[PDB]
Amino acid sequence: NAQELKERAKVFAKPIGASYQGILDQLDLVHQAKGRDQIAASFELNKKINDYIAEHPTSGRNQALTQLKEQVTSALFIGKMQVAQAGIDAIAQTRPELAARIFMVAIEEANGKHVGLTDMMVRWANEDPYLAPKHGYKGETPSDLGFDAKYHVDLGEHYADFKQWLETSQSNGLLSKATLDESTKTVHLGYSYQELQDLTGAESVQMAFYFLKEAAKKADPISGDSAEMILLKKFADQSYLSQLDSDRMDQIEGIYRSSHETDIDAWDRRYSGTGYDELTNKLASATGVDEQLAVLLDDRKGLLIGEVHGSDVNGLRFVNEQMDALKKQGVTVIGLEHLRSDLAQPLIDRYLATGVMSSELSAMLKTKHLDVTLFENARANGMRIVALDANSSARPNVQGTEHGLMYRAGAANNIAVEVLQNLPDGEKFVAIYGKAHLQSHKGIEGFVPGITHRLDLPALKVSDSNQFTVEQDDVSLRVVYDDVANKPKITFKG
Amino acid sequence: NAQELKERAKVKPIGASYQGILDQLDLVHQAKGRDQIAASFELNKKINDYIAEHPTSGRNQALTQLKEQVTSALFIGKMQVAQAGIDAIAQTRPELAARIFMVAIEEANGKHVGLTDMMVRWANEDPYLAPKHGYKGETPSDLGFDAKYHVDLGEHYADFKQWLETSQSNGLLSKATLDESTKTVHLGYSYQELQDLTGAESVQMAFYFLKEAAKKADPISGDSAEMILLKKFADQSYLSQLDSDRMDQIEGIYRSSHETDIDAWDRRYSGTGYDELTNKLASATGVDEQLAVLLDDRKGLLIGEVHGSDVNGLRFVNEQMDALKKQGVTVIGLEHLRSDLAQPLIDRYLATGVMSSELSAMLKTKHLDVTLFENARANGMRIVALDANSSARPNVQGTEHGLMYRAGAANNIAVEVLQNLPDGEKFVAIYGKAHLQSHKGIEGFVPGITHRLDLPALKVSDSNQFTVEQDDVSLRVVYDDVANKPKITFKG
Ligand SMILES: [Cl-]
Question: Chain A: residue nearest B371 by CA?
């Protein structure tokens, strides 16, 4: 095994190829590496073998390589693990890092833990466009930058116009994390595609972002890829792509456990039509704004107000107008899905502390149509404003299905619940979120429980006259999509 | 024998000092306009410095004749009266003296009597116009902005870099690049601009270490942190621009104190006019009733203020803004902000909707309400700054002529901006009480903003009612200090 292909390679029948010699070096890495690194290098070994065999269909090496690949694949998938061999190998032949992570989850699932998680990941790995094969910009990136780069775009002839709008933005405090290079006519961005989309409120960024997209689309017109995908697949930084794949799976692996560990029975026992709190007629009977808030906050962590994206703005209105009323009940936090916690959270914390609103923050507030008065009043009353969403929740477009909505629902809820549960002891919250997230939602392995089930609170909805109404959960949505059905599911026997 | 020195010393080796005089002499003949005058004073400076350092050289007599010729060539006839004054300034700083000269040339003919004495005396009296070399060295041209300072932080580079990057992360202090090689900072903001951004903790700290670096760089001299930055770290371009603007203000204050028709104003705003005007606001007690008469065939109105605790001016315009729009108000004047850096940021905010991090910082620094700007943009109103760094209050030892400067220099910024507005659009400016009424001067007396714009000095109370404040006539006089001194007057 170890001392097999060593002496045979020395017999110079033909000069050793650069790619083939690399296979021997990759094989040395497997025997030396330990833990899951060994497994990651093992899938990489088979990937290098496929590329050699495909590029050299008829060579004397092939027979030795097929035995190696057979011996490597057989060494990884043993016994119960053979059920997930076909699915993980398929992914491993392209993304060995992603396949290696699924392999670790399979080892644990083979020992009785987290049933169906491996299938969900294997199915989602090829079903999610963000986890598709991608290399990005792989060149000599600059290390002296004052920030972590996300894109290394080459604008070509668009460099002229982009520079104008980038310099105009930086002059007004916008797009700080961005440095140019006229020698190569490339830009080194420190902002995600979604982050730049959030700053579009400012004309300066809108134009800078416009030429960035046009530069990408012009650089790859043959593929149907959109402006966003071209930047990831061809101009993204290796470190950003490495974390992006990790963050996407963190949500999937997070949506799974949320869909199985949530005590949904007790939520129905408390807030259903036949709930013991009988919250439906209590807030209806009790008149006044402050009385309704009392019943909605007694013995509770906080409250969750709905928002129909069509034209409802009562959530953001009530919290801004009736902030003093809410302060009486003891709420020192205001949650919103409108802002991303990745870039907006630190800027909000700095604003509430100092009192000076940063340019990037002011830009986000115009894009998301959030009034500046909400933040002025919040800082005055001594309150927090937390972003209950992140870039991780980016809704993908699964072709021919409705699975994209499932990810958005669960991914965003994970981020929203994570922040609300880690608040200081005693401080209650008043989060405004979409109506779709407050009630149940269809999944691909059980069903995505709404943010209400997660926090043990009811789904509320404020009227134009400040009257709270309990919105019953739609039980019909507690099922998997019809396109999931009872297809070939990777299931172990232990 | 003006060009005889070209081959006298040439036909021991010529030193760099004497060669500098020869090179400077050739520059005088080649240069023209005011540059020739500036080069002439610079020539006499080199001659003075050569003789002062080499008092025992055969070239002194040759250079002494050259100094006579140049000095006698500049100050001819009636112009000789301003020789002793302008020459004293010339040996220390010729560019400043060159500007005074141009003004003095035309004064000899009859225009602006006493402006030369004002400038000549203010050149030495104003600490900002003192000699200042600034930074002598390499100036990077790829900074992307006009650098105002090139401070060298010895043991404070570590702490400054911390708050600078913390500022840039929040969109503050973008125009400032570091050089770890020399441990210097190519700062693109002025001293007052950083003071106006003190509201933000990020800047305040960086501004604190910026001073400490300067204080330790020159601890022996009893100069303030600000002056040390000018005298040893300011960019040559910024120093030339600073001295220019300071003299423009003095020259601008003279015009105001001699061209403003104070009689026409005083007759219809204080004497019979006050009694008749006071009855309008007294009788008509409505909110719109008062604004109608105060804007009756007028450019606008001016509300006074006392920085102690009175903030009715800022509070009134923010609240009843719609009421002001009915009579014809559009522009909203404001002393608190300074046009130099704030005006472009305001024009952006009102247009694009996104507030600049630096603007937001300024608003908190000057304790301005943010909703004033929000309501302005929504109602389609403009906000302009009626102040600048040009009106930098100077500390003149043993006298109160420093108060005179800001009183007049600030009004020039206010008046020039308020007058140059679209035809038909009225304005509502909030300013200090001192600036609305008359103030003491050095040549004459600095007239307030009310006299120049032909408006009254109003002051809104807590119950929203305009009360006309009488102009203090006692202040319409020159200081007892400057009066009856060596006056520099020309022949008719
Ligand atoms: Cl500039």
Answer: A373
In a 3-state reduction of DSSP, which class is residue B213? helix
Nearest to B364 among A202, A350, A355 (CB): A355
Extract the tokens encoding A114: 């987290």
* B170 contacts A347? CB cut-off 8 A: yes
Q: Say how far residue A473 (Cα) sits from the centre of its chain.
A: 25
Two tokens, residue A159: 């460099």
Residues of A in contact with B170 (CB under 8 A): 173, 347, 350, 356, 358
Token digits of residue B300: 């606008």
Calpha distance A34→A37 (Å, rounded): 6
DSSP helix/strand/coil, B69: helix
The C-alpha atoms of residue B446 and residue B253 are separated, in whole angstroms, by 7
**Tokens 């911390």 belong to which residue?**
B162
The C-alpha atoms of residue B473 and residue B458 are separated, in whole angstroms, by 17
d(CA B30, CA A244): 67
Q: Which of B104, B98, B97 is nearest to B76 (CA)?
A: B104
Method of elucidation: X-ray
Chain B CA closest to residue A362:
B354
Residue whose C-alpha is closest to residue B37's, from B3, B82, B7: B82
Cα B189 to ligand 1 centre (Å): 9
Count CA within 13 A, CB hemisphere, residue A492.
Answer: 24
Query: How many angstroms does the Cα of residue B359 sit away from the middle of ligand 1?
Result: 17
If 0-12 CB within 10 Å is exposed, 13-18 middle and 19+ buried, where does residue A230 land?
buried
> Would the CB atoms of B355 and A359 count as touching at under 8 Å?
yes
Q: Which element (helix H / strand E) includes B464?
A: none
Interatomic CA distance for residues A208 and A165, integer angstroms? 5
Q: How far apart, in whole angstroms, are the C-alpha atoms of residue B149 and residue B175?
A: 11
Give the β-pairing of A459-462 and A468-470.
Answer: antiparallel
Distance in Å, CA A195 to ligand 1 centroid: 28
Nearest alpha carbon to residue B345 among B366, B359, B364, B361? B359
Distance (Å) from CA B146 to ligand 1 centroid: 4
Count Cβ atoms within 10 A of the Cβ of residue B229 and give its class: 0-12 exposed, 13-18 middle, 19 or more buried.
buried
Burial class (CB in 10 A: 0-12, 13-18, 19+), B376: buried
Element (H, E) at A229: helix A227-235
Q: Is A459 in a helix, a strand, or coil?
A: strand
Q: Report the C-alpha dihedral over residues A221, A224, A226, A229, rounded to 10 degrees.
A: -100
Residue of B179, B354, B366 to mutate for A, most A C-beta atoms under 10 A: B354
Q: Centre a 10 Å sphere on the Cβ of residue B273 and count the other Cβ atoms it contains.
A: 15
In DSSP notation, B110-140 reads TSSTTHHHHHHHHHHHSGGGS------S---
Which residues of B lie inside 8 Å of A (Cβ-Cβ)? 144, 165, 168-172, 174-175, 199-202, 345, 348, 352-358, 360-361, 364, 370-371, 374
Q: Which residue of A has its CA nearest to B188?
A: A171
- Tokens representing residue A210 in the block: 């416009």
State the residue for tokens 């997070």. Answer: A254
Comparing CA positions, the residue from B75, B68, B69, B71 lying closest to residue B116 is B75
One-letter amino acid for residue B70 of the chain:
V
